[PDB]
Design an enzyme around this catalytic site. Structure first.
Site, PDB file in Angstrom:
ATOM      1  CB  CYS A   3     -28.677 -88.565  50.157  1.00  0.00           C
ATOM      2  SG  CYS A   3     -29.577 -88.323  48.568  1.00  0.00           S
ATOM      3  CG  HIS A  59     -33.435 -85.634  51.938  1.00  0.00           C
ATOM      4  ND1 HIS A  59     -32.318 -85.123  51.311  1.00  0.00           N
ATOM      5  CD2 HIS A  59     -33.373 -86.978  51.779  1.00  0.00           C
ATOM      6  CE1 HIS A  59     -31.616 -86.113  50.786  1.00  0.00           C
ATOM      7  NE2 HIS A  59     -32.235 -87.250  51.055  1.00  0.00           N
ATOM      8  N   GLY A  85     -29.978 -94.177  48.052  1.00  0.00           N
ATOM      9  CA  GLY A  85     -29.269 -94.673  49.211  1.00  0.00           C
ATOM     10  C   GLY A  85     -27.921 -93.974  49.315  1.00  0.00           C
TER      11      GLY A  85
HETATM   12  C1  LIG Z   1     -30.461 -89.815  48.070  1.00  0.00           C
HETATM   13  C2  LIG Z   1     -31.338 -90.141  49.299  1.00  0.00           C
HETATM   14  C3  LIG Z   1     -31.056 -91.506  49.918  1.00  0.00           C
HETATM   15  O1  LIG Z   1     -30.021 -92.117  49.797  1.00  0.00           O
HETATM   16  O2  LIG Z   1     -32.154 -91.966  50.577  1.00  0.00           O
HETATM   17  C4  LIG Z   1     -32.159 -93.342  50.917  1.00  0.00           C
HETATM   18  C5  LIG Z   1     -33.363 -93.620  51.811  1.00  0.00           C
HETATM   19  C6  LIG Z   1     -31.315 -89.425  46.824  1.00  0.00           C
HETATM   20  C7  LIG Z   1     -30.278 -89.656  45.683  1.00  0.00           C
HETATM   21  C8  LIG Z   1     -30.922 -89.959  44.334  1.00  0.00           C
HETATM   22  C9  LIG Z   1     -31.638 -91.311  44.082  1.00  0.00           C
HETATM   23  C10 LIG Z   1     -31.518 -91.596  42.571  1.00  0.00           C
HETATM   24  N1  LIG Z   1     -30.304 -90.860  42.240  1.00  0.00           N
HETATM   25  C11 LIG Z   1     -29.938 -89.952  43.175  1.00  0.00           C
HETATM   26  O3  LIG Z   1     -28.967 -89.247  43.046  1.00  0.00           O
HETATM   27  N2  LIG Z   1     -32.187 -88.214  46.893  1.00  0.00           N
HETATM   28  C12 LIG Z   1     -33.358 -88.122  46.834  1.00  0.00           C
HETATM   29  O4  LIG Z   1     -34.078 -89.148  46.724  1.00  0.00           O
HETATM   30  C13 LIG Z   1     -34.065 -86.779  46.703  1.00  0.00           C
HETATM   31  C14 LIG Z   1     -34.794 -86.430  48.008  1.00  0.00           C
HETATM   32  C15 LIG Z   1     -35.517 -85.075  48.064  1.00  0.00           C
HETATM   33  C16 LIG Z   1     -36.340 -84.985  49.345  1.00  0.00           C
HETATM   34  C17 LIG Z   1     -34.515 -83.930  47.987  1.00  0.00           C
HETATM   35  N3  LIG Z   1     -35.017 -86.878  45.605  1.00  0.00           N
HETATM   36  C18 LIG Z   1     -34.578 -86.861  44.355  1.00  0.00           C
HETATM   37  O5  LIG Z   1     -33.382 -86.745  44.070  1.00  0.00           O
HETATM   38  C19 LIG Z   1     -35.621 -86.992  43.264  1.00  0.00           C
HETATM   39  N4  LIG Z   1     -35.542 -85.834  42.366  1.00  0.00           N
HETATM   40  C20 LIG Z   1     -36.608 -85.087  42.076  1.00  0.00           C
HETATM   41  O6  LIG Z   1     -37.716 -85.304  42.550  1.00  0.00           O
HETATM   42  C21 LIG Z   1     -36.395 -83.915  41.115  1.00  0.00           C
HETATM   43  C22 LIG Z   1     -35.989 -82.659  41.897  1.00  0.00           C
HETATM   44  N5  LIG Z   1     -37.640 -83.654  40.324  1.00  0.00           N
HETATM   45  C23 LIG Z   1     -37.934 -84.555  39.311  1.00  0.00           C
HETATM   46  O7  LIG Z   1     -37.209 -85.493  39.021  1.00  0.00           O
HETATM   47  C24 LIG Z   1     -39.216 -84.270  38.619  1.00  0.00           C
HETATM   48  C25 LIG Z   1     -40.293 -83.537  39.215  1.00  0.00           C
HETATM   49  C26 LIG Z   1     -41.289 -83.467  38.281  1.00  0.00           C
HETATM   50  C27 LIG Z   1     -42.614 -82.792  38.451  1.00  0.00           C
HETATM   51  O8  LIG Z   1     -40.913 -84.107  37.146  1.00  0.00           O
HETATM   52  N6  LIG Z   1     -39.573 -84.608  37.417  1.00  0.00           N
HETATM   53  C28 LIG Z   1     -35.335 -88.319  42.507  1.00  0.00           C
HETATM   54  C29 LIG Z   1     -36.193 -88.416  41.259  1.00  0.00           C
HETATM   55  C30 LIG Z   1     -35.554 -89.509  43.433  1.00  0.00           C
END
Ligand SMILES: */C(=C\C(=O)OCC)[C@H](C[C@@H]1CCNC1=O)NC(=O)[C@H](CC(C)C)NC(=O)[C@@H](NC(=O)[C@H](C)NC(=O)c1cc(C)on1)C(C)C
Ligand SMILES: */C(=C\C(=O)OCC)[C@H](C[C@@H]1CCNC1=O)NC(=O)[C@H](CC(C)C)NC(=O)[C@@H](NC(=O)[C@H](C)NC(=O)c1cc(C)on1)C(C)C
Lengths: 309, 304
Positions: free
Chosen positions: B147, B43, B145
Site C-alpha cells: 500500500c 490506514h 506491504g
Molecule cells: C496494503 C497495506 C500494507 O502494505 O501494509 C503493510 C503493513 C494492503 C494490500 C493488500 C495485501 C494483500 N494484497 C493487497 O493488495 N491493504 C490492506 O491490508 C487492507 C487494509 C484495510 C485497513 C483497508 N486490507 C485488505 O486489503 C484486506 N481486504 C479486506 O479485508 C476486504 C475488503 N474484505 C475481505 O477480504 C473479506 C471480508 C469478509 C467478511 O470476507 N472477506 C486484505 C484481505 C488483507
C-alpha cells in the site's frame, strides 16, 4: 498472495537506466546512446547515411569521422566527445564528463530463453519499458519504431545494473536483433540491410515450467497430477507442440522453485504433458488461457517474493 | 514495417525518486514524497483492533507529528505537520524532495490505462502497465506491504499521478484512490465484506487493439461486412462487452483514417470474432481479445 489476477509481466524499475540515456547525432543520423562514466556506447551504424546501409564498410566510414563529427546531448546540454573507437558493432565515444548518474553496473551476455527489461528510447529520451525474452532463435519480440536504436535491455541483480542488450535492427518477420554491450550480435545477424531471416523459433519450455510453478505458488494448482514422466518421454510429447527440448540443466535451474513447492520438475512436466495433450478444457491458469513462456525461474521468484531494488 | 506490440509502462524513474517509507505504530507502508509533503494511505494509523470499524477521525486526533516516522533510504524526515484528506494522510516534512518531477493529480476514468510502480518498504520492486477496469478495480499484482504504491501516466516531462493502492477484494482484485484520497469504486478502507460491481470487457480498447494489429500488417480477422452501432451493441453485450457509444467511435477516428478501415467495419470484424472465436489463430501474438490498450496507447506505440 498477489491476487487472483494473474502474473503481471513486470519490468525492473527503470530509473537507473533512464539516468544513462543520451542522444547521439552523426551528421543527420540521430539515435540513442548509453552514458556510463566517461564513455557513451551506441550502434556503429550511427555513422551511416541513407544509402550507406545495404553493405557499409564501417572501418572506412569511421576513418572519415573525427571527434567533432559526433554530437552528443544529455537533456539540452552538449557532451563533448574527445575520443572514439569501434568495438565490434558498437562505437565507444570518450566524453570529457563522467556521468554523475552512473549506477553500479556490468555487461553480461544473455543466454537463449532468459529475459530482461527493455527501455525504449527516442532522441535520447525514454519512452516506455517492457519485459522481453531472448528467443531460442536469438531474436526478441519487441516494440520499436524508427529512431529506437541504441535503446538497451537490462536486469538488476541486487544493487547492480546488468546491461545485456542494445537494439540495432528489425527482421522481415517483425522481430528484432541486437548485440550485447561488447557489440557482439546475438544470433547470426549482421548490421546491414541485406536479406536476413530469423530461424524457426520454439517455445521456451523452461519458462513455461517456471510459470506453472508460479501458478502453484499463487494457489492455481488444478492442473497438477499424481504422476511423473521421464525427460525423454516428455520431450517426445513437447516437441510435437514445437517446445524447446528440456535438458537436465533446465531441470536444475528449476531447483529453487521445485523446493519452494515440493514438486519435482519431472512431476510438473507430467502436468505440462497432460496440458499439452488435453488442453485446458476452458479452465485458466493465473487468469490465462495460454501457457506463458517469457517468465524465467528468476522472474517468478522476483514477483512472488516482492524483491526490491 | 511492423513495430511489434508490447504492453509497456512509462519509465518509472521520476516516480522512484518520490518513494519513501512511512511508519506509525507497528505498520509500515509506502508514501509519495512530493516537495515538502508525503502522501500515504490513512490506514497506516490503524492497529489490529481498528481494522473492522475504524473511525479515522477518532484515530487520527490521537496522533501527533512525531507519531509518524518517514524514511527516505536510511534518512529520517521530520514530520512538521499532518492532515487527512479523504482516505489519505498528508504529512508535511521539514525538507523538500529535490527529485520531485513536474506533476499533477488526475482522477482517471474506467477503461483508461496507467503504470504501477509496485513498492515495498519504500523501495521499487517492479513496474507494469494496466487498465482501470470498468468496475473501478485493478487486476494488479500486489503483496502485503504494497500500500502506498502509486499508478501514473507520463506526458513528456510531467507525471500525472492517478492511483494509490489501499486494498484487495475477496475476489483477488485490487482497489485504491486518486491522489486526493477518493476511492475509485464503491469501496471503503476497512476489512469488511465488499464486492465490486459486475465487470465488462473494455470494447473501445479491444477495437483500438484490432487497429494496432492492422497497422502492424495483420488483417486476417477482417470481413466484407459492416454493422450499425445498435446492432453491434446487441451482440457485444451478450459477451459482457461495454456498450459502444458514438463518442467511442469518434475517438477511433484517427486509427480509422490511418488504416482505411471504417470503425463500423472494424466493429463488424469484432462481431465475427466474438461469435466465431479465433479458430486457434492469434492476433498480435494473443489468443484472446486484449483490452488493456487505449486508442491513445496504440497511436503512441505504433506511431510515436
Ligand atoms: C496494503 C497495506 C500494507 O502494505 O501494509 C503493510 C503493513 C494492503 C494490500 C493488500 C495485501 C494483500 N494484497 C493487497 O493488495 N491493504 C490492506 O491490508 C487492507 C487494509 C484495510 C485497513 C483497508 N486490507 C485488505 O486489503 C484486506 N481486504 C479486506 O479485508 C476486504 C475488503 N474484505 C475481505 O477480504 C473479506 C471480508 C469478509 C467478511 O470476507 N472477506 C486484505 C484481505 C488483507
Ligand atoms: C534503428 C535505426 C535508428 O534508430 O536509426 C536512427 C537514424 C533501427 C530499428 C528498426 C526501426 C524499425 N524497427 C526497428 O527495430 N535499425 C535499423 O533501421 C537497421 C539499420 C541497419 C544499418 C542495420 N535496419 C533495419 O533494421 C532494416 N532491416 C533489414 O534491412 C533486414 C536486415 N532485412 C530485411 O528487412 C529483409 C527483407 C527481405 C525480403 O530480405 N531482407 C529495417 C528494414 C529498417
Amino acid at each position: 498472495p498477489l491476487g487472483s489476477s494473474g502474473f503481471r509481466k513486470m519490468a525492473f524499475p527503470s530509473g537507473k537506466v533512464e539516468g544513462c540515456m543520451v542522444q547521439v547525432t552523426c551528421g543527420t543520423t540521430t539515435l540513442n546512446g548509453l552514458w556510463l562514466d566517461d564513455t557513451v556506447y551506441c550502434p556503429r551504424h550511427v555513422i551511416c547515411t541513407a544509402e550507406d546501409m545495404l553493405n557499409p564498410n564501417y572501418e572506412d566510414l569511421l576513418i572519415r569521422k573525427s571527434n567533432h563529427s559526433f554530437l552528443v546531448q544529455a537533456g539540452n546540454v552538449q557532451l563533448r566527445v574527445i575520443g572514439h573507437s569501434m568495438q565490434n558493432c558498437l562505437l565507444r565515444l570518450k566524453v570529457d564528463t563522467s556521468n554523475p548518474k552512473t549506477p553500479k553496473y556490468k555487461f553480461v551476455r544473455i543466454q537463449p530463453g532468459q529475459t530482461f527489461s527493455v527501455l525504449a528510447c527516442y532522441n535520447g529520451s525514454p519512452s516506455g519499458v517492457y519485459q522481453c525474452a531472448m528467443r531460442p532463435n536469438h531474436t526478441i519480440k519487441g516494440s520499436f519504431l524508427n529512431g529506437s536504436c541504441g535503446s538497451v535491455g537490462f536486469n538488476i541483480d541486487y544493487d547492480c545494473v546488468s546491461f545485456c542488450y542494445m537494439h540495432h535492427m528489425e527482421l522481415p518477420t517483425g522481430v528484432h536483433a541486437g548485440t550485447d554491450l561488447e557489440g557482439k550480435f546475438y544470433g547470426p545477424f549482421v548490421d546491414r540491410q541485406t536479406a536476413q531471416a530469423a530461424g524457426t523459433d520454439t517455445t521456451i519450455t523452461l519458462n513455461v515450467l517456471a510459470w506453472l510453478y508460479a501458478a502453484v505458488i499463487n494457489g492455481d494448482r488444478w492442473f497438477l497430477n499424481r504422476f511423473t514422466t521421464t525427460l525423454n518421454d516428455f520431450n517426445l510429447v513437447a516437441m510435437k507442440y514445437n517446445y524447446e527440448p528440456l535438458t537436465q540443466d533446465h531441470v536444475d535451474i528449476l531447483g529453487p522453485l521445485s523446493a519452494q513447492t515440493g514438486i519435482a520438475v519431472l512431476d510438473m512436466c507430467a502436468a505440462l504433458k497432460e496440458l499439452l495433450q488435453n488442453g485446458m478444457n476452458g479452465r485458466t491458469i493465473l487468469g490465462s488461457t495460454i501457457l506463458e513462456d517469457e517468465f524465467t525461474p528468476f522472474d517468478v521468484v522476483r514477483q512472488c517474493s516482492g524483491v526490491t531494488f
